[PDB]
Swiss-Prot record, chain A:
UniProt gene name: rpoZ
Lineage: Bacteria, Bacillati, Cyanobacteriota, Cyanophyceae, Synechococcales
GO-annotated biological processes: DNA-templated transcription
Assembly mode: In cyanobacteria the RNAP catalytic core is composed of 2 alpha, 1 beta, 1 beta', 1 gamma and 1 omega subunit. When a sigma factor is associated with the core the holoenzyme is formed, which can initiate transcription.
Annotated family: Belongs to the RNA polymerase subunit omega family.
Record's protein name: DNA-directed RNA polymerase subunit omega
Keywords linked to the UniProt accession: DNA-directed RNA polymerase, Nucleotidyltransferase, Transcription, Transferase
The enzyme's E.C. designation: 2.7.7.6
GO CC annotation: DNA-directed RNA polymerase complex
Entry function: Promotes RNA polymerase assembly. Latches the N- and C-terminal regions of the beta' subunit thereby facilitating its interaction with the beta and alpha subunits.
Superkingdom field: Bacteria
Catalysed reaction, written as an equation: RNA(n) + a ribonucleoside 5'-triphosphate = RNA(n+1) + diphosphate
A molecular function GO annotation: DNA-directed RNA polymerase activity
Swiss-Prot record, chain B:
Subunit structure: In cyanobacteria the RNAP catalytic core is composed of 2 alpha, 1 beta, 1 beta', 1 gamma and 1 omega subunit. When a sigma factor is associated with the core the holoenzyme is formed, which can initiate transcription.
Organism of provenance: Synechococcus elongatus (strain ATCC 33912 / PCC 7942 / FACHB-805)
Function per UniProt: DNA-dependent RNA polymerase catalyzes the transcription of DNA into RNA using the four ribonucleoside triphosphates as substrates.
Family stated for the protein in its record: Belongs to the RNA polymerase beta' chain family. RpoC2 subfamily.
Domain of life: Bacteria
Stated name of the protein: DNA-directed RNA polymerase subunit beta'
Residues of the full protein shown: 4 to 49 of 1318
Curated annotation (Swiss-Prot), chain C:
Gene field: rpoC1
Assigned protein family: Belongs to the RNA polymerase beta' chain family. RpoC1 subfamily.
Subunit relationships: In cyanobacteria the RNAP catalytic core is composed of 2 alpha, 1 beta, 1 beta', 1 gamma and 1 omega subunit. When a sigma factor is associated with the core the holoenzyme is formed, which can initiate transcription.
Function: DNA-dependent RNA polymerase catalyzes the transcription of DNA into RNA using the four ribonucleoside triphosphates as substrates.
Protein name: DNA-directed RNA polymerase subunit gamma
Domain of life: Bacteria
Length: 55, 46, 122
């Protein structure tokens, strides 16, 4: 849900120590995602993946 | 998290609401503060 | 200046004031050349040189030194300096702030059932 994405976003903003750097990482990840998927929306999947990787 | 809320047994003006929002942000984060603000908005409107 | 930066479009023809300023400069320069070719009286040549100086002045910055060159209506002509200065100048109207695509504008009403991260778009 939207709320879930909002909690995951907040979760990634913390433990990163740089909101800009983690926004750049999310952008890059989502770009790669859509690129290797054209072969859900990229930024959303990127945030889901990065949250699930933070264990 | 882990910070249990205090039972505010008093009248709630704007100052009390602002204090509660600040406490929620300080202890719980920015998305639980958003949720609390939405819930308080719904309750007040009702 | 390149002609597309002083466009002469057809609606009638709408012309930039730079065309008139350049025409004044060219007319006075050609007349000065003719006067220098026929060995005109010195006062006439000197007056033409003064006119050329004033025309170039009005082109670079209208009204800085002498009188202000008005147009068909009694308004100052926009010279080269007037383009890059002021709140309507190039820097503040086109470089530091622009009209952008993919934009809209509408009246706002209150959506009480929305969430803080949501908006109602028509």
């Amino acid at each position: 849900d939207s709320q879930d994405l909002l909690f995951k976003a907040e979760s990634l903003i913390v433990n990163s120590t740089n909101r800009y750097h983690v926004t750049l990482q999310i952008a890059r990840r989502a770009k790669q995602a859509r690129y290797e998927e054209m072969e859900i929306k990229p930024v959303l999947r990127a945030i889901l993946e990065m949250s699930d990787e933070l264990n | 998290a882990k910070s249990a809320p205090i039972f505010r047994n008093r009248v709630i003006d704007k100052k009390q609401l602002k204090k509660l929002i600040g406490w929620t942000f300080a202890h719980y984060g920015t998305a639980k503060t958003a949720v609390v603000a939405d819930d308080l908005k719904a309750l007040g409107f009702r | 200046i390149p002609p597309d930066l002083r466009p002469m479009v057809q609606l009638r023809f709408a012309t930039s004031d730079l065309n008139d300023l350049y025409r004044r400069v060219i007319n006075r320069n050609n007349r000065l050349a003719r006067l220098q070719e026929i060995l005109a009286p010195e006062i006439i040549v000197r007056n033409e040189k003064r006119m050329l100086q004033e025309a170039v002045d009005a082109l670079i910055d209208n009204g800085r030194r002498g009188r202000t060159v008005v147009g068909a209506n009694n308004r100052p002509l926009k010279s080269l300096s007037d383009i890059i200065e002021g709140k309507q100048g190039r820097f503040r109207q086109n470089l530091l702030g622009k009209r952008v695509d993919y934009s809209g504008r509408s009246v706002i009403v209150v959506g009480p059932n929305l969430k803080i991260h949501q908006c109602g778009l028509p």
